[PDB]
Symmetry: C5
Amino acid sequence: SLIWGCELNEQNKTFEFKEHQLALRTVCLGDKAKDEFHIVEIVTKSVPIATLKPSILPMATMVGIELTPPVTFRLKAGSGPLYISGQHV
Amino acid sequence: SLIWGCELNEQNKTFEFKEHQLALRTVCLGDKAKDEFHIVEIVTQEEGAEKSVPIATLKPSILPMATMVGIELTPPVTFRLKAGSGPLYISGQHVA
Amino acid sequence: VSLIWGCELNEQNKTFEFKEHQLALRTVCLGDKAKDEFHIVEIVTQEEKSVPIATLKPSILPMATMVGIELTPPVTFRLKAGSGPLYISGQHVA
Amino acid sequence: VSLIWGCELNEQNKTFEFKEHQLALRTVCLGDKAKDEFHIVEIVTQEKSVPIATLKPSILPMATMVGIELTPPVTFRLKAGSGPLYISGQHVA
Amino acid sequence: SLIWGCELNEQNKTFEFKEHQLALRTVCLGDKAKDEFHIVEIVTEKSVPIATLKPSILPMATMVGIELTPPVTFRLKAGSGPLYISGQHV
């Protein structure tokens, strides 16, 4: 077990996590993130897993989401920064 | 275990997922979704009568997403967009 | 053996009595036509003891995810406040 | 041996004590007549108070507690807010 | 187990949790906290944001499945606080 995390933003919309297993914990926006909808999806086919917005819902708790690498996280919408936290087992 | 997901919207209000188990994880709205209440329900047949069970109510400006916990379903299961224009995304893990 | 379950509570039918079995709750959410006011659902048992488990409101918090709540029938769900409809979803396992 | 449990905290009754036994918390939610202000519930041990929830009628009327299992005795204190604030849980033994 | 908790604020932005495992339960703001975004991150250097709160938007958050092996430092990346973190020290 090793705490893990990544940041997605306008300039770096994608992050890839390349046995091993990643359990997600939270997704949250930076305080300087544009006040608009942010959507993070997992790409393998893309699957939206979270929709956040600073003035509406600044974060979300992920539960029971365990992924087998490799997995790519893409910022479908929003300027970010958007942080994803998890445990790399 | 295989990550799964579907989109429901005004055009396609229904998605029929057809030993297997589907564990739901999240429900979230698209950024272009109409700012109104969206309701997703699971539909099954009960006593020869249709029975739908609402599992989530979302709205862009109020609650753009929800985390589903402990919801494991045995196919076949139909997800219906009871209300809202969508798009509404449902994510889950399809384990077989 | 599991079976998806659910019920609606509203002004007209403020109560629903769910009559080895266990009911695991999953979510509580409001209908889109529900009055924009606070809705409170409570579980009622004889000890009469009622235990509030959720407070919702259309314009504030339209739904809630229930976790680790497993009940042994019989159990009654009562709409303490609000016009509804308020839906409760769960899994009835046996 | 599980038994649904619950208590109400308010301005006049800021404290409630839960006096092997285990209490698993499920939800915290405000009454519809609760003052539109921040409500904070904390667990107190001897003291040692630990805030576990911050609610407000017009902002966040309730919260789902997860994985919180307590060994009696435990005291719940309404650090702030008029209430009523309800705490639900499963008392097993 | 042993219930645990700490407060982070403008004047005490950091708290270090010095086999043992800390399971987090909730993060919530004090009623006197400045109405602005508060961000708490875990630091190991690698800092990992785990929560973004704001009094008038989202006053608290439930942490799930987050179990940590000491030592672990919690840092208030942003916000005046107070911000409370609750957990079970097993």
